[PDB]
């Protein structure tokens, strides 16, 4: 059985200091190549460095992007592998993999040093570096109209904009209504602050009578706002 | 990157697919292939020459010629809906690994919907914060893809905007959104603003205007 958890995830600011975890079982820790990846939010997997055995004198290789800066090392006599990370960058985000690495070469057509591929993975941990301090969200009505309506239904929402940092979770009418709702994926602004939208259709008819709020929670800013949307008044 | 693979490829449910990797060191090293879905661990699937990992399903097989290898699905399920990474040395000889750009595999398993868009202009009270946004909301398609461009009178917007990356509603349709920030000048200093959502070839406008 193995098992790989990565830890010491966590918000820094840039040109902070970081160190990541890695507990490894159920495998010969001792002799086993460890590889950290790491995948920036929205992007692919990145290959960040590799430690090797005693075979090769524990020697690490770094990605470019990366080197100078990180450092990779290992304690067998707990099974723990380490990414130590210094003057850390924005880019330098997101999740990070800790991966049991094989060694694969063919002795016919292969050329050397064959091949490194990764056997195992852990859940992976969140690195998150920012200058950004924690806010909480200002909350903006998107009112319902002859605009929003179509096929005898009709769509309004809530605009969560500018918090920090993630996540938002947002309701309607305190749960009662969850069908129709759809709450988007946050997005990320230059300013570093992040924004999304809560969205639910709605029967035209019901406009008119049923009341409609949204609750958004904000736990890293202890934040909690009910926000009633309505259709706007023309005057 | 060093390793090229197709950003996103589509296949029938039940059908077979090929999605490749591209590289100068392939010609010398063998590639491995990995899937992954959002919230889990990555899953080694081929590596080597003929290797797969017991435990993948036989359906997953790996090829290579030149300077390309390959990854083919021999009759994909729904739950092969997933991002798809190569990986590979990024020279011939070097001891450094790097990965693809990944591909993102859709598999279709439903008839295609036509999105259904709204556009909400800037809302009097966020006006009155100094701040404009017009928001884009797009629901009720398939598959997840769609184009968003941002038009200010009839000329191209670049720069404000911010799109959501599709995901899937209650009724496994997909919904995205895409964000316009503007300053209250810009917004009053123009006729119209239109939200173009391109999804399968076709367009869909929405508009709104300042004048309310």
């Known amino acids: 059985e193995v098992q790989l958890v990565e830890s010491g995830g966590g918000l820094v600011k840039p040109g902070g200091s970081l160190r990541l975890s890695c507990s490894a079982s159920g495998f010969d820790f001792d002799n086993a190549w460890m590889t950290w990846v790491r995948q920036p939010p929205g992007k692919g997997l990145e290959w960040v460095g590799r430690i090797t055995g005693p075979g090769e004198g524990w020697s690490v290789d770094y990605a470019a992007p990366v080197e100078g800066r990180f450092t990779i090392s290992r304690l067998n006599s707990i099974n723990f592998l380490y990414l130590e990370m210094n003057n850390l960058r924005m880019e330098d985000s997101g999740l990070y993999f800790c991966?049991?690495?094989?060694?694969?070469?063919?002795?016919?057509?292969?050329?050397?040093?064959?091949?490194?591929?990764?056997?195992?993975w852990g859940r992976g941990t969140l690195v998150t570096v920012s200058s950004a301090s924690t806010k909480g969200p200002s909350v903006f009505p998107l009112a319902p109209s002859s605009k929003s309506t179509s096929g005898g239904t009709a769509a309004l929402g809530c605009l969560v904009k500018d918090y920090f940092p993630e996540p938002v979770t947002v309701s309607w009418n305190s749960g009662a209504l969850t069908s129709g709702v759809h709450t988007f994926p946050a997005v990320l602004q230059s300013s570093g602050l992040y924004s999304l939208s809560s969205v639910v259709t709605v029967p035209s008819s019901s406009l008119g009578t049923q009341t409609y709020i949204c609750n958004v929670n904000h736990k890293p800013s202890n934040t909690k706002v009910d926000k009633r949307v309505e259709p706007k008044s023309c005057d | 990157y060093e390793l090229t693979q197709e950003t996103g490829v589509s296949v029938a449910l039940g059908r077979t697919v090929t999605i490749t990797c591209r590289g100068d060191?392939?010609?010398?090293?063998?590639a491995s292939w990995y899937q992954k879905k959002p919230g889990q661990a990555p899953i080694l699937l081929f590596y080597?020459?003929?290797n797969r990992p017991s435990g993948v399903p036989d359906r997953f097989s790996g090829s290579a010629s030149g300077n390309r290898a390959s990854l083919t699905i021999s009759g994909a399920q729904a739950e092969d809906d997933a991002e798809y990474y190569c990986s590979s040395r990024d020279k011939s000889g070097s001891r450094l690994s790097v990965f693809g750009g990944g591909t993102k595999l859709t598999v279709l398993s439903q008839p295609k919907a036509a999105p259904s868009v709204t556009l909400f202009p800037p809302s009097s009270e966020e006006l009155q914060a100094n701040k404009a946004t017009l928001v884009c909301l797009i629901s009720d398609f398939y598959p997840g893809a769609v184009t968003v461009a941002w038009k200010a009178d009839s000329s191209p917007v670049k720069a404000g905007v911010e799109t959501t990356t599709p995901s899937k509603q209650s009724n496994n349709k997909y919904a995205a959104s895409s964000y316009l920030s503007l300053t209250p000048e810009q917004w009053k200093s123009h006729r119209s603003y239109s939200c173009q959502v391109t999804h399968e070839g076709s367009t869909v406008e929405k508009t709104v205007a300042p004048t309310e």
């Open positions: 991966a049991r690495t094989g060694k694969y070469y063919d002795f016919w057509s292969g050329y050397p040093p064959g091949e490194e591929y990764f056997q195992d």
């Open positions: 060191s392939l010609r010398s090293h063998y």
């Open positions: 080597g020459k003929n």
